[PDB]
Every structure is written in C-alpha cells, then in structure tokens.
Write a protein that binds this ligand. Structure first.
Ligand SMILES: Nc1ncnc2c1ncn2[C@H]1C[C@H](O)[C@@H](COP(=O)(O)OP(=O)(O)OP(=O)(O)O)O1
Ligand SMILES: Nc1ncnc2c1ncn2[C@H]1C[C@H](O)[C@@H](COP(=O)(O)OP(=O)(O)OP(=O)(O)O)O1
Ligand SMILES: Nc1ncnc2c1ncn2[C@H]1C[C@H](O)[C@@H](COP(=O)(O)OP(=O)(O)OP(=O)(O)O)O1
Ligand SMILES: [Mg+2]
Lengths: 874, 89
C-alpha cells in the first residue's frame, strides 16, 4: 500500500502518520495533560485501525490512494465515533491549511487561456467566433426580464465549446444552458425562446434569400422585406393560397411588430415551429409574426377592407389576446382551407343511411376531424326488420364498423339515449376484458340523459327501456313533451300493448353508469333536456347529441351536419392591476366574433350537409382560456366563493360583448337565414333560458343562481332585431393554443404545479411561474423550497413554511373539492348558449362520491360533463 | 361507397366478390395529408365488420400488390387480430 502525496511523489503507507494526525487533533481541543492517556491512545489506534481496514477491505494486494482520500476517512472515523469536538476541529484545521495551499497556488499562477474557437461554416470554412454578436443576442434576449443574468449565461455556455464548433450547435448550446435556468427563475423560459429564435431567423431568412443571418431588433426592418418574399415562395410551392398575393404586402409588411416575438415562452415557440410553421424540404421558412399575418390574411381574403381587417386580426393574434382554433391556425391562408374540424351527426334508422353516416365519418375525418354521432334512432336488439323477416342485433355491430373506420382514417364519440334498449351493452363498450365482439376500444361513448331519468333516480323510481323503432318520436321530443309521451309509452308496455321493453330500477342503471365511468372512463354524462330547452334554434331543429369534446349543442338532421367553428379568449391578457379589464375585453370579443364569422365563409366543405348547416345558421363557439392563471393574478383560490363569483361575472361580461358583437355583424352582413323564430327573436337570452329551464323541470330538481351585474334589457331589445350567429359561445379544450400563448388550459385547475419534461438530454423540471412569483414576495423561494416541491410533486400542501393563503391559492386539481368546479361551471353556463368541456377530478373515489357529484352537476343546470379523473388512493 | 354497396347488396343474403387491388399499399404517399398509407387491410377490417353486421364476401388482391404478404395471413387462427379478417374470404 502506497499513497499519492499532495504533489506526485509516492510513499509507503504508514499508520503512524494517521495516528499522529488524529492525536494532534485530540491534544488541540484538550490540554497537554492528555499527552499520556490510555484513553486517547486506545481511541486513536482504534480509529486508525478501522481506517486502515477500510482501505484493505476494498482492494486486493496493495494499491494507491490519494492523500485527501485518507483525510476524508479519518474525519469519517472520528465522526461515527461521536467525537464532535475533535472531528470539527480536525475539519476546521484541515480546511485552514487547504485555504493556504489554494491561495499560495493562486499566487504562483500563470495565465495562458487563449485564443478563441473557430466556428465552422456550412460550406466547410473555418471562422473565428464573433464575441460582439454573441453579446448582442443574449442581451436582447434578457431585455425587459427580471432576475435574469446575461453574463451568467454567456460564461456557462462558453464552457462547453471546442475548436471547430458549427454555428448550428453553438446556438443549441446557448439554448441548452438557458432552459436549465428556468427551474430557479421562470423568466428564463422567455430567454430560452428568444435565443432559439436566432436559428429560426437564419433558417427562414436564408431560405427566402433576404439575409443569411439576423438579430432581433434587426427584424424591425427585415420582417417587411421577408413577408413578400415569403408569399411569393409560399404560392410558388403551392403551400400558400395564391389569393394572398391580392393583398397590399407593403402595407402589411409595415404592420408587423417584431417586438411581439419577445412574448414567446420556450414551449409556445417549440409548438409553432414543430407543427404549425410552413416548411419545405424540412426547412421552416415562416417566421412567427409572418405566421400570425398569414392566418390573419387567410381569414380576411373576403373582407371589403382586406388590409384593415387583416391588420386587426393580426394584432389580436400576435398579442395573444385571442387565439383561433388549431385547424384555423394550421390551414388559414392555404389552398382549400379546413378551418373547422369538429362535427355533429345523427344516424337514421335505415341501413343505407347508417352506411351513409359511416361514409360521412370517414370523409369528415380525412383531415383529423373530430365527430359526435347520435346513434339513438337506430333500432335495438330484438327489433323487427321487414324484408329480412328477422330481428336486429342492435347498434353495437354497427358501432364496431365505426370503431374500425376511426382506426382506418386515423376521434369519434357515439351518443345513446338512456331508454335505448341497447343501453346496457353500450355502457360496457370500453371494458378492458370480456368478449371483443362487444367492445369498441377506439371509439368514445357518451350518455344522452333525459331529465326524466334523473328524476327517477332522485325519486327511486323505475325506468323502461324501448327500442326506438317502437317509439320513433321520443328522441326528437324533450322537456315536458318528452315526459308525457314517455309515460304514455310506459303505461302501454305495462298493459302488454308494447311487447319489446325492459323495466329496470333507475338507481340500478345509474349505479352501472357511474361504475363504468369510474372503471373505463366511459360513457360520459351529458344532459339532453337543458341542451334542447336552452338551444336558440328550437324552432328549426333538435339537438340530438353533443360533440367529441362535449361543449357543442347544435341541431342535426338528414341534411345538416353541424360544424363547430371555435376560438378562445385569453383571460390572462385581460387582467390588469388585479382586475378584469372590462374595456379591453369588449374590443377583443368584437374582433374574435368577426373572425369566427369569417371562418364560416372561408372554410372549404367536403360534405354538402356541413356547408348547408353552417351557411343556414352560422354558429360559432367563442371560449376562454387562462382562467386558473387569471385567478392567480387576483390571488383567488379556485376553491372559494370569490372564484365562483369571478367565474360568474367574467362570463356575463364576455357574453354581453359576444352577443353585442353578433348584433353588429347582423347590421353589416344581415342576420342568419333562420334567425326568425329563434330564442334571440323572442328576446330569450341565455340568462332567460335558465329561468324557463327551472320552470320546466321544477325547482324540486334544479337550483341555480340567477344573479346579474349588468343591464340586459337594452341588449335584449336589439337582439330581437337580428343577430349574425345562432350560437356564440362554447368553452372547448385549448391544449395547444394555451401552450402557444403560455396560459392555463380553458377552465381547468392546475393539474400539478410541477412537471418533469424529459425527452432529449437529462430531465428539466418546470414549476408554476405564478407559484414561484408569490414565493419570492414571501421570501420563500430558495433551494430547499425547490427540493421540497420535487419531493411533493409540486403540491404546496403539507409544507410548513408556506402560509395557508398560498396553500389554498395553489391547491392542485385533485386537492380542490369537486363542488367548486361544478358550481363555477354552473354559473358560467347561465351565460353560455352552448356548453363547456368540464373535466372533473375526484380523490377518494367511491360510488357514493360519484353519485353526489353527478347529481349535483345535473341539479345545478349543467348541460355536459367530460372526462372523470378518479383516484382511489385517498 | 364500395363498403356501402356491400351492405346494400348483402341486405338479403347476397354474396360478394370485392376487387381491392387498386387501393394503395402500406407506405404509399397520401396527398390528403402528408403521411403514409397503412394499406388495404385496415379497410378490409371494415369490410369484415360489415359482413358480420349485415349477416358472404371474398376480397381479391393481385400478386404484385405490396400488401400481399399481410393479405396471405388474414385467416390464421393466432396472432394480432388487427391483422386478421376471420369473417371475410
Ligand atoms: N504514510 C501514509 N500512509 C497513509 N496515510 C498517510 C500517510 N502519510 C500521511 N497520511 C495521511 C494521514 C493524514 O490524514 C495526512 C498526513 O498529514 P501530514 O502528516 O501533514 O502529511 P502530508 O501529506 O500533509 O505532508 P506534510 O508533512 O507536509 O504535512 O495524510
Ligand atoms: N491544531 C490542530 N487542530 C486540529 N487538527 C489538527 C491540528 N494539528 C493537526 N491536526 C490534524 C488535521 C491535519 O490534517 C493534521 C495535521 O497535519 P498538517 O500537516 O499540519 O496539516 P495538513 O496536512 O492538512 O496541511 P499541510 O501539511 O499542507 O500544512 O492533523
Ligand atoms: N341485413 C341486415 N342486417 C342488420 N341490420 C339490418 C339489416 N337490414 C336492416 N337492418 C337494420 C338497419 C336499420 O336499423 C333497420 C331498418 O332497415 P332498413 O334498410 O331501413 O329497412 P326499411 O327502412 O326500408 O324498412 P322498415 O324500417 O320499415 O323496416 O334494420
Ligand atoms: Mg500536512
């Protein structure tokens, strides 16, 4: 055994040097009277033995170890023996002599580090790294952001570079060490996006022949030069609609604001660049502000004032005040643009029309469309079939054809009404096990529940199943009319005059519905009668189901496939110093509704009955997003009366402006064809729809708040003169567009304040930017807090240092009681003419808890519910 | 439309021969999107489910067709059922 001295030399391993060292430390804390002590000597030689033994235990016949490796094991032996005073003075003294070595080494230091790395160009030529341009992009990137250190990033980058780096991976190196900093300061996310933009500018501009490279503020003059170059190459490759050349590109080139690139989060820019920016040969040649300008232009190709409206639409989009739906963003400004990709259908009870509906499913899904299918009219197991002289097997064998079409065309949701004789088989279609002939693992399902069924649940009544072919009028009836006609058929079956039927207990079927929702996630629960009694289009059709995402309530028939034309307001951009900017909200809603009305005319239609319904009724669906983040800005916890109040009044405000905007389009473009007879014609607004719903169903089964903070009487008058759209509002999921704009999803509570993305190199944690901002004000943002958040997967509950006001404000989806989410949705639904996609989160998971929850959802006048997220751990 | 015809012609026990050779094979470009075709078998699955639901159908494929090897195994008793059509000849 030998030891590597501090500097090179090798010497034999001598226990004495260890024994002397430890003895020095004992004699330092004690006096000299400890010099001759059997105790010290016995202790030291014991510590020296277990140290020397440790080196023997890990190695065979001799070896070599570092001098510091021995010092560490000496401290270990002293420490494990509980020698606190001797161990710490050993550490202190040892560190004092390390300081003298470190300092003396720095005094004798010589400086060589030079020159610089040579950046390799694409053509293969070497070039010295530009330090001036490197400082420019990182400074313009840290511009306007707090607690960001540009010099810190430049130093950490400069480390991981080698002679012969390419300018390609010099930017990625800047990005790599920029997102590693978002964990301790979220504002680096903006810095990370601004650095990545440098690659995009070089990529796009170099492709367009404008410039081989450029900085941010250099875009103040280059965005106008790049736009006409972009349109010319875009149309050349048939990636952009040639009609866009009819715009005044010089005027639009000046309207572009290059500073809005600074708004992007890293995730938002990645999203657009990966999937939305136009490209050729893998090269993205569409820059972000030109992307927003393309969408604006595509939405204005038929406006009288092309440029003025295009600028109005570009300003709304590029500022993140509002964001068009995913299909609009992707296809606006391109040939035959699919601007809407959400449809509702109803399937007729004949074989030709069944397979006509299968055919429509395939065509509508050819470009990623989502579908709701009303299958209630199709006759159930045991029904007679003339011509065949046999008996039907019901809807499920046809749903299997639907299921395999969805697989073949690359989602769809089937709806069935609760008295349908196939309902029991329907509830089990998504079980993991069992007969596969009775499963549709690639198709969604939803219950179309009449009020009467829930009434029978509340009252422990019975419930009769029928085949629709024996009761063909029930599906189209609703409200009192349905309940009278249904009880007539019920009495008929009890007197043997309607053979094909099944009597069950309503509570038993209800329990089966909730257990399948819990076990399989399906079928979802949607309510037929509020969707129909509150539909503004009752005079010209019937709502036969909702859509794939359960927020749309539009009529369907033989000649009408309803189309959802969607967009969402960004509530975050309408919160100022803690308050809702009522004034700015009206301006954004007015422009949003116009853009959505334009979508109807520009949209390219594949099936004629989808064009027919859109042109006849002109429904749109204006939603919201950033609700949870808007609560943060007001310091309102989602589980409070104050959040329920904000949800009520914010929807009432948007609703007023949205309805008012539709009146303005009616003055300019004329009311939609079927306006005459609609609820709007009768002066029955959504707030009035709630009142009549309570009258119809009865206060015994529904209770909803009816408060109002605005004056609707003047608007209730102007609406009767005409509006442009049969439906205005719908709150849909906003997965992509919330990520693009950097806000929370629609109305969802935060699912978790922390997530650990891991998809390239290492894993990068992302923490709720609002949570960290509040923890700074309290002075509670530090390394230990970060280590606690990871341990608790982002939950601020049960960490002592956070005060209770923040534990409540940053409660996660599974630690907010479900009643808050339902009551909030209930008050938003008072002002929405369609519905809202409502995910529910339930910890504890019991059939009892599901019962009280979905009874409450119905009792509070909700039209739809969506996914159930259930945990049985609590 | 061809699948619609199958259901209508089978409505009263009729028998069918379907030529599927013109439908493009796995890997073919589709200008509908910018993706690749998964071949004829995913549509034959719809034919299979239609024979079952309307209950008789024989699908034909030419020997140079690039999906032929999957086609040859559609009636094996074992294996991935998404690559099988047990109710279709
Ligand atoms: N022969 C050896 N075998 C094993 N460990 C040794 C040996 N010599 C020294 N050590 C260990 C024990 C102590 O922790 C430390 C000795 O410190 P010290 O006696 O000051 O020697 P050193 O390497 O620092 O040289 P110096 O005489 O300049 O102090 O290193
Ligand atoms: N006065 C003291 N108090 C505490 N520990 C001591 C004292 N004197 C010696 N020791 C311990 C810790 C040291 O590692 C070791 C003494 O060796 P020493 O050579 O003086 O220090 P060192 O090896 O860490 O640095 P260097 O040799 O470079 O001066 O024994
Ligand atoms: N061969 C079959 N296999 C399975 N289901 C069938 C078959 N033929 C008919 N059906 C089902 C599909 C529809 O739900 C229902 C009605 O079929 P359809 O073709 O419309 O007859 P029909 O409408 O001309 O006469 P009717 O409705 O008066 O009995 O029967
Ligand atoms: Mg020493």
């Amino acid at each position: 055994l030998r030891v590597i001295k501090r500097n090179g030399t090798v010497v034999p391993y001598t226990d004495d040097k260890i024994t002397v060292a430890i003895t020095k430390a004992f004699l330092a804390v004690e006096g000299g009277t400890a010099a001759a002590s059997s105790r010290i000597h016995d202790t030291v030689r014991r510590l020296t033995e277990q140290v020397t033994a440790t080196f023997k235990r890990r190695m065979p016949s001799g070896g070599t170890i570092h001098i510091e490796e021995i010092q560490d094991q000496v401290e270990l032996a002293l420490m494990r023996a509980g020698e606190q005073k001797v161990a710490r003075d050993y550490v202190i003294y040892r560190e004092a002599r390390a300081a003298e070595r470190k300092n003396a080494g720095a005094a004798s230091d010589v400086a060589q580090p030079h020159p610089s790395i040579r950046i390799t160009r694409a053509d293969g030529s070497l070039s010295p790294l530009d330090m001036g341009r490197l400082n420019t992009i990182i400074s313009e990137a840290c511009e306007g952001l707090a607690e960001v250190d540009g010099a810190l990033i430049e130093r950490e980058t400069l480390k991981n570079l080698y002679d012969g780096v390419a300018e390609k991976d010099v930017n990625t190196a800047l990005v790599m060490t920029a997102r590693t900093l978002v964990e301790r300061e979220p504002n680096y996310s903006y810095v990370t996006a601004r650095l990545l933009m440098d690659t995009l500018r070089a990529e796009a501009l170099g492709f367009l022949g404008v410039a081989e490279s450029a900085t941010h503020h250099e875009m103040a003059e280059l965005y106008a030069k790049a736009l006409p170059a972009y349109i010319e190459k875009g149309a050349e490759f048939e990636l952009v609609d040639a009609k866009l050349k009819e715009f005044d590109l010089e005027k639009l080139g000046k309207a572009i604001d290059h500073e809005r690139d600074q708004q992007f989060t890293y995730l938002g820019l990645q999203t657009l660049y990966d999937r939305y920016f136009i490209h050729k040969d893998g090269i993205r040649f569409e820059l972000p502000q030109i992307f927003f300008m393309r969408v604006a232009m595509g939405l204005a190709i038929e406006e009288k004032d092309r440029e003025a409206r295009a600028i109005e639409f570009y300003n709304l989009l590029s500022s993140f005040d509002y964001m068009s739906s995913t299909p609009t963003l992707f296809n606006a400004g391109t040939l035959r643009p699919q601007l809407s990709s959400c449809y509702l259908t109803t399937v007729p009870d004949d074989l030709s029309g069944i397979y006509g509906a299968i055919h429509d499913n395939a065509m509508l899904s050819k470009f990623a469309g989502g579908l709701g299918n009303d299958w209630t009219p199709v006759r159930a197991l045991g029904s007679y079939i003339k011509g065949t002289n046999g008996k039907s097997q019901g809807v499920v064998p046809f749903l299997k054809v639907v299921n395999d079409t969805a697989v073949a065309v690359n989602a769809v949701c089937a709806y069935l009404e609760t008295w349908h004789l196939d309902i029991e088989e329907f509830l089990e279609l998504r079980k993991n096990t069992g007969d596969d002939r009775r499963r549709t693992h690639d198709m969604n399902t939803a219950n179309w529940i009449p009020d009467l069924f829930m009434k029978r649940v509340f009252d422990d009544g019975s419930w009769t199943l029928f085949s629709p072919s024996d009761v063909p009028d029930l599906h189209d009836l609703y409200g009192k009319a349905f309940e009278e006609r249904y009880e007539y058929y019920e009495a008929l079956a009890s007197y043997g005059k309607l053979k094909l039927h099944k009597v069950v207990q309503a509570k038993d079927l209800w329990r089966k519905m909730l257990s399948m929702l819990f076990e399989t996630g399906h079928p979802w629960l949607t309510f037929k009668d509020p969707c129909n009694l509150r539909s503004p289009q009752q005079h010209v059709g019937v709502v036969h189901s909702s859509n794939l995402c359960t927020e749309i309530t539009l009529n369907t028939n033989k000649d009408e496939i309803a189309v959802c034309n969607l967009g969402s307001i960004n509530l975050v951009n309408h919160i100022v110093d803690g308050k809702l900017d009522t004034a700015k909200l009206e301006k954004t809603v007015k422009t949003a509704v116009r853009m959505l009305d334009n979508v109807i005319d520009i949209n390219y239609y594949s099936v004629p009955q989808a064009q027919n319904s859109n042109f006849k009724h002109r429904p749109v669906g204006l939603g919201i997003m950033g609700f949870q983040d808007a609560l943060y800005l007001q310091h309102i916890p989602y589980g409070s009366d104050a959040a329920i109040a904000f949800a009520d009044q914010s929807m009432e405000a948007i609703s007023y402006y949205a309805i008012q905007a539709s009146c303005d389009l009616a003055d300019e473009r004329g009311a939609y064809q079927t306006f005459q007879g609609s609820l709007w014609s009768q002066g029955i607004l959504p707030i009035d729809s709630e009142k009549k719903l309570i009258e119809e169903r009865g206060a015994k089964y529904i209770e909803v708040d009816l408060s109002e903070t605005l004056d609707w009487a003047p608007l209730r008058e102007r609406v009767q003169k005409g509006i442009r759209n049969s439906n205005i509002m719908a709150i849909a999921p906003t997965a992509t567009i919330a990520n693009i704009t950097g806000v929370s999803q629609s109305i969802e509570p935060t699912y978790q304040n922390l997530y650990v993305k891991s998809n390239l190199s290492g894993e990068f944690t992302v923490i709720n930017p609002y949570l960290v901002r509040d923890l700074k004000a309290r002075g509670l943002w530090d390394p230990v807090m970060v280590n606690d958040l990871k341990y608790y997967d982002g939950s601020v509950q049960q960490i002592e240092r956070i005060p209770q006001d923040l534990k409540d404000l940053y409660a996660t989806a599974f630690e907010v009681e479900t009643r808050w989410i339902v009551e909030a949705a209930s008050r938003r639904q008072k002002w929405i003419d369609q519905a809202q996609s409502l995910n529910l989160y339930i910890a504890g998971a019991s059939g009892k808890k599901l019962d009280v929850t979905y009874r409450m959802a119905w009792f509070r006048g909700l039209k739809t519910t969506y996914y159930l997220r259930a945990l049985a751990a609590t």
